[PDB]
Ligand binder design. Structure first.
Ligand SMILES: CCCCCCCCCCCCO[C@@H]1O[C@H](CO)[C@@H](O[C@H]2O[C@H](CO)[C@@H](O)[C@H](O)[C@H]2O)[C@H](O)[C@H]1O
Ligand SMILES: CN(C)c1ccc(O)c2c1C[C@H]1C[C@H]3[C@H](N(C)C)C(O)=C(C(N)=O)C(=O)[C@@]3(O)C(O)=C1C2=O
Ligand SMILES: CCCCCCCCCC(=O)OC[C@H](CO)OC(=O)CCCCCCCCC
Ligand SMILES: CCCCCCCCCCCCCCCCCC
Ligand SMILES: CCCCCCCCCCCCCCC
Ligand SMILES: CCCCCCCC
Lengths: 144, 240, 157, 240, 457, 48, 48
C-alpha cells in the first residue's frame, strides 16, 4: 500500500524472483511491479506438469523468502494461485434505489453471498469484484 | 519415495520451527532441497585478459549467471565457488570511540538512510472533485554506491561539524563472505558446483545447463570465458 | 491546452526531430505546458535532445520557463549532465542564478552529480558560487559532503 | 464499531480535556482501496467472478449457482438486484442442442437415402441401429481417456459423421448388390459380401489411424486442441 | 486516456460510452458494466473498460445487429472523443491462444544497463520495425511509458538538528498520503482490516505537503517544508522483468500475406543490431508456435509413411498404394474454394475437416482399387475390364454416403445464429471438399489405378 | 577434534552498575567480530 | 494462544474454512475451536 513500481520491484519482486529456484519443469518466469503497489510474478510450466505440484513448490520457496520482504508486505500477504483465467459466469450485484455505495454492496456480497456460492456444487474459485468493509480512519492534519 | 512429496512433508514441519529460529537465521534464508550429494558438473569461469579479479568474477557469476542455472529443471542444488558482492562497512573502533558511537548507531543509521519508502501519490484515490494532477510520491530509495553509504550522517557535533559513515569505517564493495576462493590451472577462477535433482536425467539436465550458459556468453564482459574442469555426463554419452 | 500543443510535448520528449519541425511549421504552441508545468524545452532539456532544444529557442520558446516547483530547463540540463544543451540555453539568455522553490540553482544540481565541465560553463556565465539553498548549503558544501576532490578544487575560487 | 474507534484516547490535556480519535479524524466503514469505480448502467455495482471446478458439469454448476442466489433473494436489502452480464452455459446449451440436432438429422437422411435406392424399410433399420451404438461407444472411450463433452469433442463427432454413416451404408449396400447380381440368400450373401470388404475395412482403420493419431502428438497449446479432435475421431472410427 | 489523467477524467469518458450504448444501441445493448481504473495493458486512474452485455440473439435480427457490426459502429463513433483512445472489439473464442499472425517479443537488459537505456534500445527497435510495414504491422510496447512523479528529499542534517526522527517523518508521509494497514477488527463476527489515511483534501497537491507536522524530541511541532525539498522527475509506473532480468514486452503481428515465422525472423535480425548488453527472447504464443512448428514436418512424414505401408500390406504391392494416396488433392481443392469463396480462414475445424474429407475419399478409393485388383487376381479379368467393373459396383454406395453427408452438413453452412462461426467452419469446408471429392474421385481413382498398374507392371 | 576457543563472560552486575545495555554489548561484540547483515541495497539494478 | 473459542472461530477457523472450497474428491469438512485457542479443521476425501 502506497508503494511505487521501483519500491515494489527492489524490495518484493527481485527478492521473490531470486528465491524461485529448485522448482521442477519451469519454462519461463515474468513479473510486473506497478505504482498501485501491486506485483504479479507468473511462472509458466511445461505442458503435462501437475499444476498442484507446480503450485506447492512455488508456494514453499516463497514461504522461505517471506522473512526477506518488508513487514508491510508480510502483513498484507502474498497469494500463490493457479493462473486459470476462464470464468463460467459473472454475477453482478447492483443497488437500484441508490441507498448503497459500491463499497456497501461489496461488504454484503462478501458477508452474506460469496461463501455460500463457493460452497455450491461444482464451483471451483469465486473472485469478489470489490472488498469487504475496512475501518477507514480519515486523519485531519490541522486537528493533529 | 516421491522426492516432491518428501520435500512438501519435510517443509510443512520446518515452517512450524521457522518462527522459533533466530531472526538472523531467517534473514539468511533457510533452504529445503532434494538433490544428489555428489556434483553432476563444475562450470568454471576465468578472465583471459586478466581484467577481473577472483572477487570480481565471483560477483558476475552470482549476479548474472547463478539464478538462471538454479531455476533450470533438474538442478537440485547450485554451490557458488566464491561470493556475490555486498556493501561492506568495515568499522574502526578507534574512530567510533572518538565520536562516542557504537556498531549499534552505525546499523540504526544505515536502516534510516538506506531505506526504500512507500510515500503514496498526489491526487490518490479516493480523490477530491476537480483533481487534475495524479503523480507517485518518491521519497528515500536504496543506496547504489560506496560513496552514497560514505555520506550517511551518523551525528552532528555541538560545534556543528558532521560525522559521516566514511569517518568511522572503510566502505568497499566486497563478498558476502570470504570463505570460498577458487583457481583453474593456477590462475584466478570462480564457478558453479551443480548437483542433480533427485530422479532427474543427468544428460538432459547437463544439456539444459549448456543451453542456458549459451544465452549468457554473448553478454559477457571482455576476457570472461566459461571452462569445463569437471563433468560426469561426457563419460555416459561416450561409454554408451 | 491545444491539439498540436500536446503533440509537441510528446514529440519534444521522444526526440522526433522531423515531427517537431513539421509542428514548428504548423504553428504548434512552444509554451504548451503539462499538469506539472513542463514545456517542450523542459522535456527536451531533461531527455537530452539538443537538436530540438535549438529548434524550440529559434521558434520563440521561453528559455526561463519554470514548472509548479520553480525548476527551469537549465536546472534539468545541468542536473542530468547535458553540457551541449546547458551552453545553448545560457547562450540564449538562460538565468544562470535561477532558484526553484527550494532555493536550489543549476550550479547546486551540477555540483551534486559531479558534472565538472557544466560547473565551469555555469561559473563562466557568472553562476553565484556563494549561492545557498533553503538549508544554507552552497555548491562547495555539496562537494565536500559528496567527497568530490576535483569539484572541491574548481569551487575553491 | 465506528463508535468504539471514535472513543479511542490519543492524549489527556493538563486542564483535564481528553483528545479522542474522532476529534482528529473522520471514522467510517469503507473499502480496502478506492482504485476501481464499478457501475452497471450508471448504478453502483459489485459482483462475483465464478470459475468451474476440475471435472465439474458447467450446466449443473450454473443451475446450482442460480438455485443458491434464489434462496438469498428474500434477505437482500431494499434496492439490491442480481444481474448476469456474462454466462457461457446458455451458449454451451445451444452448442449441445445444435450437435444432437445435426447427429439426429444425419441419421434421418441416411434412412431417407437408404430407402430411395434400396426401397425396403428392413435395410434402413441396420444403419439406424449401428450408428447410435458407435456414437454411444464413443462417449464410453472419451470417459476412459478422461475427456469431457466440449465444443471440440462435440464438433469432433460432427466431422466424423461421414466416416460412421459410410461404414453402415457400405456393408448393407454391398449385401443388397451381391443378392441382386448372384441371387444368394441373405445369410450366404452376407458371408460373400463381408468376405470381399472385411480385409479392406481393417486396412481402412489402419490408414485412418495413421492420419489422425499423429495429430495428437503436437506439443503445447496447439497440440492440446488437436488432441481433442484426434482421440474423438480415432475412437468413433475404431468402434465403427 | 493520456498518462497523468485522473479517475474523474476517465469516469466522464466512460459515462459518454455508457450513454452511447443505452441510446444509439438501445435495441441491442442490455447493460454496460463500466470498470474505471482497470486495463489488461496495466491498471491506473487514466485507464478503464466498459463490458457491454447484449440482448438475446432472437431480439437481434440480421448481421447489422451482431457484435461484428456493433463493434465497427461503436469504434468509429468514439474516434471523435477528445484526448481518449476509445474503441470496441469482440472477445476471442479463448484467451489461451491469442492470434496466429501475432508474436510476443521480450527485450531483455543482460548487463545492468538500467531502465532508461532499455527504453532507448526499445524505441530504436520499434523505429526500425516501423520501416518494415511490408513484414511487421502494429509493432507496439505492451507496457506503460514513464510519467511525471514527485521526488521529495528529507534533509537528514536538518531533521537531526530539529530533533525529528526519520521513522516519525517516513511514517507520517507514508501513512497520510499512501495509507497504512494498522491491524484487524471484528465487524458483525467477521475479521476486517483497519486503515489510517489522510482525508482526500489534505493529500492532493504539493502545497498540502507543508500542512503535515511531525513532533520533535523537544516537543515542538515541525512542518514537512522545514526539513524537506521536492522536484519533478520521470519514472516508470510499471516495471517488467523476464527470467529474473529487467525486460520490456513488445507485441505485433505479420503484415497481410506474410507469415508469423517470417515476421519473427526479421524481429530477430533487427534485434541483433541493438546497443551492446541488450538481449531478446520469445514468450507465450511465440514460444509455443516455435517449438510446435519443428514437430509438424516429422508428424506429416510418419503419417504419410505408415499410410503407404498399411496399403502396401493390404494390396501386397509397393506400387498400387500410390493409386489410393493420389486422391488427397481431389478433396482439399473443394474445401479451399468453398472457404475462399465465403471468406473463411485456415482454422482447426477446417484443418480437421480436410483430414475427414481426405479420410472418406481415401476410403472410397481403397474399395474401388480392392474390388478392381481382386477381379484381376481371382476372376483373371483385364486391367480396364476389372477397373470398369469395380467403379460400377462402387458408384451407388459412394453417392448414397455423399448425398446423405452433403445434406447433413448443409444446415451448418447456412447457419447465422449463436455459435455459427464454429458451425460455418465445420460445415463450409466439408461440403465444398465432399462435392469435389465425390465428383472427381469416381473419374480419377480409375485413372490413378490404370496409370500406376501400367507404369509398374 | 575440539580446538581452543575464546570464552568471554559479561559481568551483568558491572554492566547494570555502569548503565550499559547487554543488547548493545552483544550487538557490538557480534557485529564487529562476527558480522551483521543490516538490510539490502541496489548494485547495478540488482538487490544485494 | 489466550483467545477463546469465539474469537478463534471468527479470526481463524472461518477465515480458513471459507478458502477450503473447490478441492478434488472432498466429501465433508468438520472443525472445532476451543478455549485454549486450538483449531483443528479435518477434510475427508473419497476412498481411492
Ligand atoms: C502393424 C500395422 C500394419 C497392418 C496393415 C495391414 C492392413 C490390413 C490387411 C488385411 C489383410 C488382408 O487379408 C485378406 O483377406 C483375409 C482376411 O482379411 C485373409 O485371409 C486370412 O485371414 C483370415 C482372417 O479372417 C482367415 O480366414 C485365414 O486364416 C487367412 O486366409 C487373406 O489371406 C487376405 O488376402
Ligand atoms: C475486474 N475486477 C475484478 C473488478 C471489477 C470491479 C471492481 O469493483 C473491482 C474489481 C477488482 C477488485 C480487486 C480487489 C482485491 N481484493 C479483493 C482486496 C485487491 O487486492 C485490490 C488491490 N488494489 O489490491 C483491489 O483493488 C480490490 O479490493 C478491488 O477494489 C476490486 C474492485 O473494486
Ligand atoms: C491418405 C494420406 C493422407 C496424408 C495426409 C495426412 C496428414 C496428417 C498430418 C497431421 O497429423 O497433421 C494434421 C494437421 C494438424 O495441424 O492438420 C492439418 O493441418 C490438416 C492437413 C491438411 C493438408 C494435408 C496435406 C495435403 C497436401 C497435398
Ligand atoms: C498406427 C498409427 C499410429 C502411429 C502414430 C505414432 C506417431 C508418434 C509421433 C512421434 C513424434 C516424433 C517427433 C519427432 C520430432 C523431432 C524433430 C527433429
Ligand atoms: C522411413 C523408412 C521406411 C520408408 C518406407 C520404405 C518403403 C520400402 C519400399 C521398397 C521398394 C522395393 C521395390 C522392389 C522392386
Ligand atoms: C442439456 C442436457 C444434455 C447433456 C448431455 C448432452 C450430450 C450430448
Amino acid at each position: 500500500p502506497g508503494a511505487d513500481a521501483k519500491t515494489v520491484q527492489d524490495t518484493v519482486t527481485q527478492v521473490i524472483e531470486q528465491n524461485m529456484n529448485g522448482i521442477d519443469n519451469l519454462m519461463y518466469m515474468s513479473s510486473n511491479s506497478d505504482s498501485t503497489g501491486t506485483v504479479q510474478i507468473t511462472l509458466t510450466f511445461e505442458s503435462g506438469t501437475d499444476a498442484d505440484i507446480a503450485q506447492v513448490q512455488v508456494q514453499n520457496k516463497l514461504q522461505l523468502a517471506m522473512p526477506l520482504l518488508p513487514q508491510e508486505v508480510q502483513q498484507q500477504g502474498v497469494s500463490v494461485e493457479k493462473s486459470s483465467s476462464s470464468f463460467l459466469m459473472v454475477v453482478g450485484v447492483i443497488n437500484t434505489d441508490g441507498t448503497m455505495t459500491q463499497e456497501d454492496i461489496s461488504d454484503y456480497v462478501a458477508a452474506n453471498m460469496k461463501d455460500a456460492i463457493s460452497r455450491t456444487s461444482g464451483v471451483g474459485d469465486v473472485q469478489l469484484f470489490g472488498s469487504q468493509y475496512a475501518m477507514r480512519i480519515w486523519m485531519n492534519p490541522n486537528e493533529l | 519415495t516421491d522426492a516432491d512429496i518428501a520435500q512438501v512433508q519435510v517443509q510443512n514441519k520446518l515452517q512450524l520451527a521457522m518462527p522459533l529460529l533466530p531472526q538472523e537465521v531467517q534473514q539468511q534464508g533457510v533452504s529445503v532441497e532434494k538433490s544428489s550429494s555428489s556434483f553432476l558438473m563444475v562450470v568454471g569461469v576465468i578472465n583471459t585478459d586478466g581484467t577481473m579479479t577472483q572477487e570480481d568474477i565471483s560477483d558476475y557469476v552470482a549476479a548474472n549467471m547463478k539464478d538462471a542455472i538454479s531455476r533450470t529443471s533438474g538442478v537440485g542444488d547450485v554451490q557458488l565457488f566464491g561470493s556475490q558482492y555486498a556493501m561492506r562497512i568495515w568499522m574502526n573502533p578507534n574512530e567510533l570511540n572518538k565520536f562516542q558511537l557504537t556498531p549499534v548507531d552505525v546499523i540504526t543509521a544505515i536502516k534510516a538512510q538506506n531505506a526504500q519508502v512507500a510515500a503514496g501519490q498526489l491526487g490518490g484515490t479516493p480523490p477530491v472533485k476537480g483533481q487534475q494532477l495524479n503523480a507517485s510520491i518518491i521519497a528515500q530509495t536504496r543506496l547504489t554506491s560506496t560513496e552514497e553509504f560514505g555520506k550517511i550522517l551518523l551525528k552532528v557535533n555541538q560545534d556543528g561539524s558532521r560525522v559521516l559513515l566514511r569517518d568511522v569505517a572503510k566502505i568497499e564493495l566486497g563478498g558476502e563472505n570470504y570463505d570460498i576462493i577458487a583457481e583453474f590451472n593456477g590462475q584466478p577462477a570462480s564457478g558453479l558446483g551443480i548437483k542433480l535433482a533427485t530422479g532427474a536425467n543427468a544428460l538432459d539436465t547437463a544439456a539444459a545447463i549448456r543451453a542456458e550458459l549459451a544465452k549468457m556468453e554473448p553478454f559477457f564482459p571482455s576476457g570472461l570465458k566459461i571452462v569445463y574442469p569437471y563433468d560426469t555426463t561426457p563419460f555416459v554419452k561416450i561409454s554408451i | 491546452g491545444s491539439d498540436l500543443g500536446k503533440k509537441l510535448l510528446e514529440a519534444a520528449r521522444a526526440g522526433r526531430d522531423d515531427e517537431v519541425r513539421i509542428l514548428m511549421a504548423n504553428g504548434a504552441d512552444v509554451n504548451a505546458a503539462d499538469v506539472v508545468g513542463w514545456t517542450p524545452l523542459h522535456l527536451a532539456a531533461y531527455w537530452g535532445h539538443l537538436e530540438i532544444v535549438e529548434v524550440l529557442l529559434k521558434n520563440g520558446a521561453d528559455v526561463n520557463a519554470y514548472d509548479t516547483l520553480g525548476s527551469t530547463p537549465l536546472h534539468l540540463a545541468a542536473h542530468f549532465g547535458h553540457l551541449e544543451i546547458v551552453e545553448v540555453l545560457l547562450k540564449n539568455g538562460a538565468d544562470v542564478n535561477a532558484k526553484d522553490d527550494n532555493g536550489i540553482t543549476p550550479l547546486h544540481l551540477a555540483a551534486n552529480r559531479g558534472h565538472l565541465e557544466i560547473v565551469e560553463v555555469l561559473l563562466k556565465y557568472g553562476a553565484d558560487v556563494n549561492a545557498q539553498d533553503k538549508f544554507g548549503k552552497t555548491a562547495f558544501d555539496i562537494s565536500i559532503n559528496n567527497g568530490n576532490e576535483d569539484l572541491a578544487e574548481i569551487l575553491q575560487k | 464499531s465506528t463508535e468504539e474507534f471514535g472513543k479511542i484516547l490519543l492524549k489527556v490535556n493538563q486542564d483535564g480535556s481528553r483528545v479522542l480519535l474522532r476529534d482528529v479524524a473522520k471514522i467510517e466503514l469503507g473499502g480496502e482501496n478506492y482504485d476501481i469505480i464499478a457501475e452497471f448502467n450508471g448504478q453502483p455495482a459489485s459482483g462475483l467472478g465464478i470459475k468451474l471446478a476440475t471435472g465439474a458439469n458447467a450446466l449443473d454448476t450454473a443451475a446450482a449457482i442460480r438455485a443458491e442466489l434464489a434462496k438469498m433473494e428474500p434477505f437482500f436489502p431494499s434496492g439490491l438486484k442480481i444481474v448476469y452480464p456474462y454466462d457461457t452455459t446458455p451458449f454451451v446449451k445451444i452448442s449441445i442442442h445444435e450437435v444432437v440436432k445435426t447427429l439426429v438429422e444425419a441419421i434421418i437422411l441416411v434412412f431417407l437415402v437408404m430407402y430411395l435406392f434400396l426401397q425396403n424399410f428392413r435395410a434402413t433399420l441396420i444403419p439406424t441401429i449401428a450408428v447410435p451404438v458407435v456414437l454411444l461407444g464413443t462417449f464410453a472411450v472419451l470417459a476412459a481417456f478422461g475427456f469431457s463433452i466440449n465444443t471440440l469433442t462435440m464438433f469432433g463427432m460432427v466431422l466424423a459423421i461421414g466416416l460412421l454413416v459410410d461404414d453402415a451404408i457400405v456393408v448393407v449396400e454391398n449385401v443388397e448388390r451381391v443378392m441382386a447380381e448372384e441371387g444368394l440368400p441373405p445369410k450366404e450373401a452376407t458371408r460373400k459380401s463381408m468376405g470381399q470388404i472385411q480385409g479392406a475395412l481393417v486396412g481402412i482403420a489402419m490408414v485412418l489411424s495413421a492420419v489422425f493419431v499423429p495429430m495428437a502428438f503436437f506439443g503445447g497449446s496447439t497440440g492440446a486442441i488437436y488432441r481433442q479432435f484426434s482421440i474423438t475421431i480415432v475412437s468413433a472410427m475404431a468402434l465403427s | 486516456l493520456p498518462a497523468g489523467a485522473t479517475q474523474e477524467r476517465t469516469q466522464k469518458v466512460l459515462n459518454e460510452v455508457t450513454h452511447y450504448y443505452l441510446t444509439k444501441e438501445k435495441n441491442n445493448v442490455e447493460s454496460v458494466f463500466a470498470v474505471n481504473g482497470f486495463g489488461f495493458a496495466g491498471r491506473g486512474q487514466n485507464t478503464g473498460i466498459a463490458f457491454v452485455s447484449l440482448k438475446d440473439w432472437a431480439d437481434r435480427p440480421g448481421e447489422e445487429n451482431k457484435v461484428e457490426a456493433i463493434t465497427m459502429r461503436a469504434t468509429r463513433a468514439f474516434s471523435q472523443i477528445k484526448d481518449a483512445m476509445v474503441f470496441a472489439f469482440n472477445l476471442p473464442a479463448t484467451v489461451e491462444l491469442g492470434t496466429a499472425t501475432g508474436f510476443d517479443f521480450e527485450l531483455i537488459d543482460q548487463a545492468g544497463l538500467g531502465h532508461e537505456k532499455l527504453t532507448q534500445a526499445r524505441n530504436q527497435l520499434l523505429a526500425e520495425a516501423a520501416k518494415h510495414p511490408d513484414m511487421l504491422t502494429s509493432v507496439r510496447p505492451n507496457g506503460l511509458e514513464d510519467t511525471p512523479q514527485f521526488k521529495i528529499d528529507i534533509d537528514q542534517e536538518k531533521a537531526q538538528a530539529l530533533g525529528v526522527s526519520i521513522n516519525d517523518i517516513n511514517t507520517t508521509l507514508g501513512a497520510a498520503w499512501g495509507g497504512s494497514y494498522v491491524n484487524d477488527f471484528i465487524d458483525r463476527g467477521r475479521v476486517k482490516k483497519v486503515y489510517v489515511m489522510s482525508e482526500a483534501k489534505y493529500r492532493m497537491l504539493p502545497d498540502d505537503i507543508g500542512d503535515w507536522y511531525v513532533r520533535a524530541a523537544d516537543g515542538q511541532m515541525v512542518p514537512f517544508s522545514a526539513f524537506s525539498s521536492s522536484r519533478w522527475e520521470y519514472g516508470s509506473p510499471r516495471l517488467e522483468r523476464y527470467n529474473g532480468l529487467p525486460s520490456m514486452e513488445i507485441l505485433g503481428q505479420a503484415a497481410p500475406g506474410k507469415s508469423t515465422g517470417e515476421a519473427m525472423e526479421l524481429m530477430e535480425q533487427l534485434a541483433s543490431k541493438l546497443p551492446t548488453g541488450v538481449g531478446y527472447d520469445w514468450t507465450g504464443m511465440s514460444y509455443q508456435e516455435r517449438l510446435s512448428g519443428n514437430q509438424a514436418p516429422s508428424l506429416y512424414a510418419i503419417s504419410l509413411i505408415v499410410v503407404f505401408l498399411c496399403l502396401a500390406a493390404l494390396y501386397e504391392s509397393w506400387s498400387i498404394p500410390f493409386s489410393v494416396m493420389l486422391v488427397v488433392p481431389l478433396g482439399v481443392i473443394g474445401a479451399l474454394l468453398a472457404a475462399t469463396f465465403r471468406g473463411l480462414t485456415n482454422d482447426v475445424y477446417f484443418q480437421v475437416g480436410l483430414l475427414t474429407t481426405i479420410g472418406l475419399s481415401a476410403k472410397n478409393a481403397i474399395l474401388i482399387v480392392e474390388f478392381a485388383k481382386d477381379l484381376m487376381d481371382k476372376e483373371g479379368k483385364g486391367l480396364i475390364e476389372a477397373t470398369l467393373d469395380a467403379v460400377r459396383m462402387r458408384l451407388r454406395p459412394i453417392l448414397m454416403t455423399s448425398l446423405a453427408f452433403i445434406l447433413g452438413v448443409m444446415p451448418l453452412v447456412i447457419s447465422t445464429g449463436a455459435g455459427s462461426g464454429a458451425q460455418n467452419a465445420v460445415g463450409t469446408g466439408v461440403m465444398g471438399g465432399m462435392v469435389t471429392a465425390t465428383v472427381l474421385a469416381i473419374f480419377f481413382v480409375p485413372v490413378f489405378f490404370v496409370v500406376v498398374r501400367r507404369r509398374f507392371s
